[PDB]
Amino acid sequence: ASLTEIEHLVQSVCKSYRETCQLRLEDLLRQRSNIFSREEVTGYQRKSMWEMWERCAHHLTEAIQYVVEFAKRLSGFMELCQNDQIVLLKAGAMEVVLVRMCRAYNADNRTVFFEGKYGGMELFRALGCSELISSIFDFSHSLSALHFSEDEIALYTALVLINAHRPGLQEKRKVEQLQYNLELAFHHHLCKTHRQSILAKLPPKGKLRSLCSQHVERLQIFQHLHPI
């Protein structure tokens, strides 16, 4: 791949995420002053766990709805056998979602955008795992601190999916090629922006997995919804 092409490659990945941003960042920050009141909060605590995980998986699956449409318009993607085209899309998409929510994080008050307003980790007390909740908050913090940009998120998420180390792959020497040209397009654009400092500030390779993989286990008992 050449520079004029490595150019456009990066140029496209950022165009996708723009429309598939679920919520416009334009509106994400604008609604910062909209907060659930304590009754609205204690109201969200009244509910039984069964209700939340549904609401969760509802907006979640409605979100992953977008993610795929985003993930589809890439390059080299379609030209992968459907076995390997999916091993990724299945194992990858949650990790991607976890990332994509860092924008929803308002680090100024440690709150998150859930169905119309902003509220903290107490909005989800009823799920009985405050630790994992904060643990995710803590994760989203460590990116809100990196102050990820729209074009940064896109290019990093576009590398979460493309993992040729995911076992169960049969076009391995096909996947690798799409990884490299994405790894390269990533770094070589961080350089032209001089953001290379984050390449060590990046959340561990495995934390992103071991948090989403922990996100599904304590959901596997309540609902098993994997959208294709």
Ligand X SMILES: COc1cc(O)c([C@@H](CC(=O)N2C[C@H](C)C[C@H](C)C2)c2ccc3c(c2)OCO3)c(OC)c1
* Residues lying near ligand X in the complex (CB under 6 A): 22, 56, 59-60, 63, 97-98, 101, 112, 114, 124, 127, 132-133, 136, 140
CB closer to ligand X out of 162 and 211: 211
The smaller minimum CB distance to ligand X, of residues 67 and 80, is found at 67
User: Taking the complex as a whole, how short is the minimal distance between the CB of residue 160 and ligand X, in angstroms?
Assistant: 14
Please list, residue by residue across 19-32, b when 16 or more beta carbons sit within 10 angstroms of its beta carbon and e when fewer do.
Answer: ebbbeeeeebeeee
**Nearer CB in complex with ligand X: 94/162:** 94
- Quick one: 161 or 185, whose CB is closer to ligand X? 161
> Which amino acid belongs to residue 33?
S
Extract the tokens encoding 15. Answer: 């165009």
Q: Residue 99 Cβ, how far from ligand X at the closest point, in Å?
A: 8
Contact 190, 18 (CB under 8 A): no
Cα separation of 186 and 97, whole Å?
19
**SS3 call for 117:** strand
Contact 45, 122 (CB under 8 A): yes
Nearer to ligand X, 115 or 183 (CB): 115
Please, what is the minimum distance in Å from the beta carbon of residue 166 to ligand X? 20
128: left (phi over 0), alpha (psi -120 to 50) or beta: left
Least distance between ligand X and beta carbon 60 (Å): 5
For the CB of residue 172, give the shortest distance to ligand X in the complex, in Å: 30
CB atoms within 10 A of CB 224: 9
In the complex with ligand X, the residue whose CB is nearer, 128 or 168, is: 128
* Least distance between ligand X and beta carbon 106 (Å): 11
In the Cβ-directed half-sphere of 217, how many Cα atoms lie within 13 Å?
Answer: 8
- Closer residue to ligand X, CB minimum distance, 111 or 185: 111
Give yes or no for a contact between 184 and 10, defined as CB atoms under 8 angstroms apart: no
Question: Least separation, in Å, of the C-beta of 42 and ligand X?
Answer: 16
- Cα distance between residue 130 and residue 122, in whole Å: 8
For residue 194, CA distances in Å to 89, 197, 199, 205 come to 31, 8, 11, 22
